[PDB]
Design a protein around this ligand. Structure first.
Ligand SMILES: [Fe+3]
Length: 309
């Protein structure tokens, strides 16, 4: 019986949690919140943490925890399960990537066509989009986005981009809120992750949705793709079943259970989504090194500098 600190979306976690419990009989308690938060918590907690597994939407949350030496090394059968082109890997094998999600511009087909969007995410930080483009200053993927821009364009491009969005864009508390504010026509478009779109259309009916996803591709920073992952805590009193849970996640069955219900890119080579996901290669993602702890820090220094924080 295990306790998962779940930074992942509730739908995501309950799919894999339930699928695991069917295969093993092992119960999963879900403690849901922001990975950001839960990572800080786990730090506070030390050996007192009740958390067996940590499930994150983004690798940086895993990286900091890994930098603190709080994660249990995993076997090279878990790790290798999702070993693949461009997939981030832990120096200490103390976490494993599991699924990928693309950066997207979601736009109102009512008001815009793809033709009318930008060929670079850099360009939304502009008078031209004054109150026309939404962003999420607290989103984990937003942070990885700033990271990418610093690496690909430099930290001057990245603060200028932040400041532009600050001045001309509109902020939202979550990506879902961002997307839903666009569907209410409050906002013409917004920077989000791809998988939210699928979920919306499934709940609402695609015929009732007027937004589309745009794919900047061409190794533009906006074409970035980031990775969700999991890990076992050193403190765990249920280590073996915690390792099993994570094995399940990177294994075929775990990937089919997640990707069956959530529009994220599955990382196990033996698995393919039935969600008509845009072919990852066609994404033309920039080939960006993994986010490092002091790369993540730098970017929040920027977040502060720009007025978001
Ligand atoms: Fe998300």
């Amino acid at each position: 019986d295990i306790t998962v600190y779940n930074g992942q979306h509730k739908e995501a976690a309950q799919a894999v949690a339930d699928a695991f419990t069917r295969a093993t009989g092992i119960k999963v308690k879900l403690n849901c919140a922001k990975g950001d938060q839960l990572a800080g918590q786990i730090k506070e907690e030390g050996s007192r943490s009740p958390a067996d597994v940590f499930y994150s939407e983004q690798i940086p949350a895993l990286a900091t925890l890994s930098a603190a030496n709080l994660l249990e090394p995993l076997p090279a059968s878990t790790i290798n399960e999702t070993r693949g082109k461009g997939v981030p890997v832990a120096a200490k094998k103390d976490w494993v990537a599991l699924s990928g999600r693309s950066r997207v511009v979601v736009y109102d087909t009512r008001k815009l066509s793809e033709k009318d969007l930008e060929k670079s995410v850099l360009n939304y930080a502009t008078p031209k989009w004054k109150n026309r483009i939404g962003y999420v200053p607290t989103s984990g993927a937003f942070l990885e986005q700033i990271v990418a821009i610093v690496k690909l364009k430099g930290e001057a491009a990245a603060l200028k981009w932040l400041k532009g969005l600050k001045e001309y864009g509109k902020p939202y508390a979550k990506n879902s809120v961002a997307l839903q504010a666009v569907e209410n026509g409050e906002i013409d478009a917004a920077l989000i992750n791809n998988y939210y779109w699928h979920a919306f259309a499934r709940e609402k009916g695609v015929q009732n949705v007027h937004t589309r996803l745009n794919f900047v591709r061409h190794r533009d920073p906006g074409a970035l793709v980031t990775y969700s992952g999991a890990a076992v805590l050193k403190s765990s009193q249920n280590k073996d079943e915690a390792k099993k849970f994570v094995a399940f996640l990177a294994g075929k069955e775990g990937q089919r259970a997640l990707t069956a219900v959530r529009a994220e890119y599955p990382l196990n080579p033996h698995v393919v989504s039935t969600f008509n996901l845009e072919p990852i290669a066609k994404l033309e993602a920039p080939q960006v090194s993994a986010t490092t702890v002091s790369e993540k820090e730098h970017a929040t220094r920027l977040l502060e500098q720009a007025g978001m924080k």
